[model samples]
Target chain A: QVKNDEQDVELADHDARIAANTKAINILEVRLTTAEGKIVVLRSDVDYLLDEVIDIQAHLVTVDQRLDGVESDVSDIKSDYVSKTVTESQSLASPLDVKTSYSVDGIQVVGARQTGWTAATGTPLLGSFNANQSYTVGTTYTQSEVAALATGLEQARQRILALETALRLHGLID
Target chain B: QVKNDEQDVELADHDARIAANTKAINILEVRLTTAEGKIVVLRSDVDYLLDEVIDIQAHLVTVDQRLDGVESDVSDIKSDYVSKTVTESQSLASPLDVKTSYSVDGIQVVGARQTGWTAATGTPLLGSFNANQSYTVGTTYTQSEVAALATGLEQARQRILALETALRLHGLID
Candidate 1:
């Protein structure tokens, strides 16, 4: 009778131990499943962020390329415009002025003529049956007049060079 | 006695099974911890990527701002430079050749002479004394001379207009 009682106590202890182990295993499996799910979500987030970064980088490159083209075109237009103006300005030169007249003995002769800068009229002569007279036509220009025209040509050339230099600094011209 | 021995064997088997279960539980816990650790790493990677994306976006904004400034500068330079050149060309007119001569009657006594196409010389001639010989100075210009100078002025104006049109297409001008 005592032996039967001991066997029953031992069986009960073994059953309790098995139940505890099963409980531990179930809890651990649950924990692992939850961790795996979180990892998957984190991985996806990383992938999405990576794709977004790549997309933006590509956009930036495209914008930069377009900007380069715009710069070159603008520079070329400015340089060519200035250069053409320079060529046109340099071609224009002032014509010379000339005057002619008749002189008798270096004295006023009536009916003698004057063309440019002087009114045309005939006048009676005074003085001169004694020595000699001379008739001549003169061609000349004022010093200031020649200098002013020269400055125009120089100014055009300077403007062209200035534009080229300015464009170069903008990285628009080689 | 037999029943007692059977109980002992059962207890031993249960103890062994409990030990195996404990080992399994321990392995599961280790796996779960490792997975949790990996999730931490993945989460950090995602945060890093997100930050990288943000940084790239910020950089793009800065680049766009700089491009805007570049466009403005290029437009201003082109407009101002061309405008100044046009003004300079316009002021360069009026340097025409002036030729004037005075004549009296059929007899010509030259008083003034001007010519780019003519050689220099003085001449006198006799004429019939008809009613009083008319004495006057003539001032005039050739057809080709006026047209040529007018072209220079016209060319500058047209160039300015063309450049303005071209720049407008680039979105740099209104």
Candidate 2:
């Protein structure tokens, strides 16, 4: 048989509070341990992901540089190309226009550009062209000499006649 | 004087244990709240970084495609350039040559290649070149005519002479 005195009853309330606190502590401890595990895994995931991002960024720089070099190469190619537009092609980008071989009284004249070519739009480097009208390859001819003989004059006249004749036989002067 | 009953003495120890647990519970609860906050921050970092990684990977794909486009552009320009070289830049490549011009009668003539070019190594796309020797721009010349005149005078005879005249007039005649 148990008897409750005034003092004993007072102790009963305290006992109840203590019992509740102990159980809460035990349960909280378990939850804390579990949370710690999750944090570890989560942090690890972030670290691994960041490492991968750095690698990707490095690759990006590499490809970007290669592209720069390639674009530069293209720029140089186009820059060195004939400064003639489509119309320029029709008339030839002169100076470079008469670069070909013609007959001198039927002798194989020497030239640079007249070998194996065509005259059409989108025709490789020069675009469009005139086979009969090309420039000299690299002879140091004064501009004035050709200017006086732009149409004709003696040594130049015979020379041009020979050039025109060559052009004719090459299928032109037809 | 406090009178001790056997059961009362047993209760004293239990009360002490209860007091200790109550304090532990209060402290543990505070710590648990703090831990929850940390976990939230850590998890957020992982999610954000993952998003960044996906974005970076997408950029990589974009850069890769751009590089591929540049490569194709190089190819297209190649398609339209002189397909010859000094051994292909000297046994290297071709077609991009003969896209120059020269002098016709010891005078600036018509043609292509032989422009302001040099025979240097690593000279952009077309590589090395022979200033005096290059192909024509565009004017469909039959293979046989060029073959026969491969080296001779023309109009059957004077024709080659004219071609050679253009070539020689330009420079090689030097």
Candidate 3:
């Protein structure tokens, strides 16, 4: 009777251990799923940012054209204004400075459909990475809208700098 | 004691009515919030569609210029083909449809930023509509792309029709 009682106790302990392991596995599985969900959301945000960047580049090109057109208009206006005024050629006001640096003659984002490269970009040093198109949000992006995005990038840079400063205080990076 | 019980019953009934009213108000508030949210989303969609239309217009202009240049080439090609061909006065396959319908001279969907009643005609019409701006839709919107929006619009139209139908069916309208 004593031996049987001991055997029953051992069996119960083994069963309890199995149940604990199963609970741990289930918890881990749930955690993994949550992590995956977060990753998907993050990937989507990154792609959205990239698309926004591309659109901003296009707008920048347009702004540049507009600035050039304005310059031309100014020149034309100068001759007329001078003729209408007192002189043959009165000196005009200072020319406006404009920033226009974006490639307009490259392959289009839509035209790349025939190619296998869909939103995929090859890093200068590293290998190519696939664009997380599935995660993108928002449809419109333009260069004129880059100020907001640039501000975001600036804030992110500041945060990183602060983090780096703290890390250096603790000797993380050289 | 009987009078006090009667007063208590009256108070309980009053409290129930107030609670029910509060619940109803809460439900109405939730519906209002949802409607407002939908409006905001729809407004955003409209803004995006407008931007897309603008970009399309810009690209169409580019394509227009390109087609003009191609026309000159095509003319040259026709002459060359006529000379080479056995048949006299034979024109090459005419690329007449090279121009896109969404060009600057195309149909204007989003009118210029003006809306008012014509004082003379008493008809509502667009005002201050700037003709300087170009309007176009670069890529044709596919049915699948607009199906949801079309459904929303259709639902609105159906609701209006249903109201009219109900009035006519019930002899509510003369």
Most lDDT-accurate candidate: 2
Q: Per-residue CA lDDT of candidate 1, range A1-174, in tens?
A: 686787677677767877888888788778878887887888688778768867897887888786987779686865545343232332212221222322222322222121111111223223232223232323643434433333332333233334333333432223
Estimate, for each residue in B1-174, the C-alpha lDDT of model 2 and write its tens digit: 254465577677777877777887788789888988888887887888888888888988898898888888887876565322212221212212232343443455534323343323221111111112222222333455334323221111332344344444444342
RMSD of 1: 22.5
- What DockQ would candidate 2 receive versus the native complex? 0.11
TM-score of chain A of 3: 0.39
Ranking by lDDT: 2, 1, 3
Deviating ranges (above 4 Å) for candidate 3: A1-174, B1-7, B80-82, B87-174
lDDT of each: 0.48, 0.51, 0.39
Native-referenced Cα lDDT, model 3? 0.39
Candidate 3 chain A: 10-residue stretch with minimal lDDT: A125-134
Clash count for each candidate, listed in order shown: 12, 94, 4
What docking grade applies to model 3? incorrect
What's the residue-level lDDT of B36 in candidate 2?
Answer: 89
Best to worst by TM-score, what's the order? 2, 1, 3
lDDT, residue A62, candidate 1? 82
Instruction: Write model 3 residue lDDT over B1-174, tens digit each, in one string.
Output: 464565456556555655655565565556556655655655565566568657766866775565565556545443443232243222222211111111111221111112121111112222332324333333853433333332333333333334333333432221
Candidate 2 docking classification: incorrect
Q: Residues A1-174, candidate 3, lDDT per residue (tens digit)?
A: 557556556556655655565565556556655655655565565557557756865875685576556556554644433122132223324221112111122421111002132232222111111111112112453343334334333433343343333222222122
lDDT for model 2, please.
0.51
